[PDB]
């Protein structure tokens, strides 16, 4: 037999040059029969759970779906609490879910008279609704009313569930600041592709982005810049809670990161007492890394960390707090072991488990409840985590979505090489680490070189779609040639969503 790898498309990207559903990530099974369902102006969404509490949660999910459908159809589809759907209805239910599909899995069966989504949990109804939107014609994902398109769904049968539990996106809001609205939008867009985790990198050398009432100069001084010129910005604790709440409506866990003991210049520029000479650092607007450190052997450091953790824990319902631990090149191995163990103890005392970048798993203060985010992905990375029974989230070069697509990309970095849509697809988490409990995947969007929403869109789309499929779809069902053609077919939907994607010439 003969095989090949993909080159660039002759005459340019098909995402420039280009009944038909466009499901991404690829579901476990999808079959199509004869006939079709038509969504009309008279349609209602019926919801039915196993008890009134569950029905009420499904009702909220139904309303969110109705809002989306109404925006493009111009209909006023309403939601009804009933297990007796009428012909032409969408029906969302958790009664009789296939337990083998787990919390996020679902069956989605469309007949001429009815769309029926059957799940184990409300969460699975939400994930299934992301598929439902992709079964309707391109146009349905428009934010304004679309005319001249019949709103049809083919008679079809889908069963689905994720391969990995953790399928995340990290946004760096320290290097360049993004508004609450911009962050909500990225969360919203990601959710449509079954991303279920949002990691916020809230602090680094060039900025501190979260209000800490006990240390107000973190904002008054530490938030007032960013990479390059800019004014920076920050989230009040109320704005952070708003983001958390918005993500929760999409069954997305928000994991906040306060990076320590490295990547701490913004804190060090806010409070002189955090530095050995007692003087504030100058703010930094360059892109260098590795040079900053908290004082590992000063009690003031641990008081500062405790105050930050106390306040953040109070406003962050996730059982996880990410404490960074990357590129602590100004911290000795001995001090790093000690520091990371001490801050893990503090986090645990406030009821939070710790996530940290490698090599944080090597800290003698880690527990089997701590989680390693393995970004290095080398032969020895996560040896400690594996020995300690720690879950691992993988973020290899293939998940570093801030890398240039190509040598000539107008934005992006390249310290992990180039990452085009193909590279972002052609890997497996088991490639990054062997013999581990792999919790999942996280796409990381660092923002050294991204200033605008358009820059975010350009790098995340279509690259995030590749990573999202690596997280959701089983390896045996993944195939670049298949994904590539599905992605081409999906292009109008990205357009319709107003995503300023890159038309990658490898697609």
> Do residues 412 and 402 lie in contact, with contact meaning Cβ atoms separated by under 8 Å?
yes
Adjacent-strand bridge partners of 198: 169, 254
Q: Is 3.40.50.300 the CATH number for 1-17+164-507?
A: no
Integer Cα distance of 492 and 502 in angstroms: 13
CA atoms within 13 A on the CB side of 124: 28
Residue 441 main-chain phi, psi, to 5 deg? -125, 145
Integer Cα distance of 276 and 294 in angstroms: 9
Integer Cα distance of 294 and 311 in angstroms: 19
Q: Determine the 3-state secondary structure of 220 from DSSP.
A: helix
Maximum pairwise Cα distance, the chain: 76
* Residue among 173, 176, 172 at smallest CA distance from 227: 176
First to last CA, the chain: 24
Question: Tokens 């889908």 belong to which residue?
Answer: 158
How would DSSP label each residue in 25-86? SPPSEEEEEEEEEE--TT--EEEE-SSHHHHHHHHHHHHHHHHHHHHHH-----EEE-S-PP
Experimental method: X-ray
Count helices and strands in the chain by DSSP H and E runs = 14, 15
* Residue among 389, 351, 387, 349 at smallest CA distance from 370: 389
Question: Tokens 């009309």 belong to which residue?
Answer: 40
Adjacent-strand bridge partners of 374: 394
> Do residues 419 and 400 lie in contact, with contact meaning Cβ atoms separated by under 8 Å?
yes
Integer Cα distance of 222 and 229 in angstroms: 14
Integer Cα distance of 493 and 382 in angstroms: 39
Question: Tokens 């009690």 belong to which residue?
Answer: 299
> Can the peptide bond before residue 86 be classed as cis, meaning omega within 30 degrees of 0?
no
**Delimiting residues of CATH 3.20.20.80 domain(s) in the chain:** 1-17+164-507
Integer Cα distance of 96 and 119 in angstroms: 8
> Can the peptide bond before residue 462 be classed as cis, meaning omega within 30 degrees of 0?
yes
**For residue 247, what are its two tokens?**
């993500």
Q: Determine the 3-state secondary structure of 409 from DSSP.
A: coil
DSSP assigned state of 137? P
Question: Is 416 buried (19+), middle (13-18) or exposed (0-12) by CB count in 10 A?
Answer: middle
Integer Cα distance of 161 and 429 in angstroms: 17
Per-position b or e across 51-70, b if 16+ CB within 10 A of its CB = eeebbebbbebbeebbebbe
DSSP assigned state of 116? E
How would DSSP label each residue in 238-257? HHHHHHHHHHHTTT-EEEEE
Per-position b or e across 383-396, b if 16+ CB within 10 A of its CB = bbbbebebbbbbbb
**Delimiting residues of CATH 3.30.379.10 domain(s) in the chain:** 18-163
DSSP assigned state of 8? P
Per-position b or e across 83-113, b if 16+ CB within 10 A of its CB = eebeebbbbbbbeebeeebbbbbbbbbbbee
Integer Cα distance of 62 and 47 in angstroms: 7
* Residue among 132, 14, 135, 137 at smallest CA distance from 491: 14
Integer Cα distance of 120 and 100 in angstroms: 9
Angle at 352 between CA 348 and CA 355, to 5 degrees: 100
Question: Is 2 buried (19+), middle (13-18) or exposed (0-12) by CB count in 10 A?
Answer: exposed
Q: Where are the alpha helices (DSSP H) in 152-212?
A: 180-191
> Cα separations (Å) of 100 from 16, 84, 167, 212, 247?
40, 26, 19, 44, 26
In three-state form (DSSP H/G/I as H, E/B as E, the rest C), the secondary structure along 265-284 is HHHHHHCHHHCCCCCCCCCC
Q: How many residues are recorded in the chain?
A: 507
* Residue among 396, 397, 345, 353 at smallest CA distance from 371: 353
Q: Is 3.40.50.450 the CATH number for 18-163?
A: no
Adjacent-strand bridge partners of 201: 172, 257
> Do residues 344 and 370 lie in contact, with contact meaning Cβ atoms separated by under 8 Å?
yes
Integer Cα distance of 453 and 497 in angstroms: 14
**For residue 267, what are its two tokens?**
């804190």
Strands 197-201 and 253-257: parallel
DSSP assigned state of 197? E
Q: 327 catalytic, yes or no?
A: yes
Give all strands of the β-sheet with 106-110 in edge-to-edge order.
29-38, 152-160, 106-110, 114-119, 89-93, 45-48, 79-81
Cα 43 vs. chain centroid, distance in angstroms?
32
* Residue among 189, 152, 266, 227 at smallest CA distance from 501: 189
Question: Is 297 buried (19+), middle (13-18) or exposed (0-12) by CB count in 10 A?
Answer: exposed
Integer Cα distance of 122 and 101 in angstroms: 13
Residue 495 main-chain phi, psi, to 5 deg? -55, -50
CA atoms within 13 A on the CB side of 21: 25
* Angle, helices 52-73/122-135, rounded to nearest 10 degrees: 20
Question: Tokens 């969360």 belong to which residue?
Answer: 187
- The one catalytic residue in 165, 182, 249, 327 is 327
């Amino acid at each position: 037999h003969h095989h090949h790898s993909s080159g660039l498309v002759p005459r340019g990207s098909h995402m420039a040059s280009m009944s038909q559903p466009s499901i991404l990530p690829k579901p476990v099974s999808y079959t199509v029969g004869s006939g079709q369902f038509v969504l009309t102006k008279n349609a209602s969404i019926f919801v039915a759970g196993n008890n009134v509490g569950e029905t009420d949660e499904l009702f909220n999910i139904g309303q969110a779906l109705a809002k989306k459908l109404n925006a493009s159809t111009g209909y006023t589809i309403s939601v009804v609490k009933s297990n007796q759907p009428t012909a032409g209805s969408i029906y969302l239910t958790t009664v009789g879910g296939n337990a083998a599909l787990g919390n996020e899995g679902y069956d989605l069966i469309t007949t001429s008279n009815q769309v029926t989504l059957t799940a184990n949990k409300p969460e699975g109804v939400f994930r299934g609704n992301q598929t439902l939107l992709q079964l309707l014609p391109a146009g349905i994902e428009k934010n304004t009313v679309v005319s001249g398109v019949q709103w049809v769904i083919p008679h079809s049968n889908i069963s689905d569930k994720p391969e990995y539990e953790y399928r995340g996106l990290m946004l760096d809001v320290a290097r360049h600041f993004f508004t609450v609205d911009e962050v909500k939008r990225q969360i919203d867009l990601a959710s449509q592709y079954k991303i279920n985790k949002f990691h916020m990198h809230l602090s680094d050398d060039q900025g501190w982005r979260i209000e800490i009432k006990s240390w107000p100069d973190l904002i008054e001084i530490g938030s007032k810049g960013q990479v390059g010129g800019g004014p920076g910005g920050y989230y009040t604790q109320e704005q952070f809670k708003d983001i958390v709440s918005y993500a929760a409506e999409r069954y997305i866990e928000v994991i906040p990161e306060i990076d320590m003991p490295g990547h701490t210049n913004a804190a060090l520029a806010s409070y002189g007492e955090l530095n050995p000479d007692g003087k504030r650092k100058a703010m930094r607007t360059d892109t260098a890394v590795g040079y900053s450190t908290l004082m590992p052997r000063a009690e003031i450091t641990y008081q500062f960390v405790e105050d930050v953790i106390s306040e953040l824990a109070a406003i962050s319902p996730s059982p996880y707090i990410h404490l960074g631990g990357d590129e602590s090149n100004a911290t000795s191995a001995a001090d790093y072991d000690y520091f990371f163990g001490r801050v893990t103890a503090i986090a645990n005392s406030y009821g939070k488990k710790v996530v940290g970048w490698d090599p944080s798993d090597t800290s003698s203060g880690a527990t089997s409840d701590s989680v390693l985010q393995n970004w290095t992905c080398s032969a020895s990375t996560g040896t400690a985590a594996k020995a300690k029974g720690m879950k691992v989230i993988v973020s290899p070069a293939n998940a570093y979505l801030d890398m240039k697509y190509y040598s000539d990309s107008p934005i992006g970095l390249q310290w992990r090489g180039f990452v085009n849509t193909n590279r972002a697809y052609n890997w497996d988490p088991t490639d990054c680490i062997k013999g581990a409990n792999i919790y999942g995947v996280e796409s990381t969007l660092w923002t050294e070189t991204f200033v605008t929403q358009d820059h975010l869109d350009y790098m995340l789309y279509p690259k995030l779609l590749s990573n999202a499929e690596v997280g959701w779809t089983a390896r045996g069902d993944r195939n670049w040639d298949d994904f590539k053609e599905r992605l081409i077919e999906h292009t109008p939907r990205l357009q319709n969503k107003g995503i300023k994607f890159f038309a990658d010439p490898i697609v």
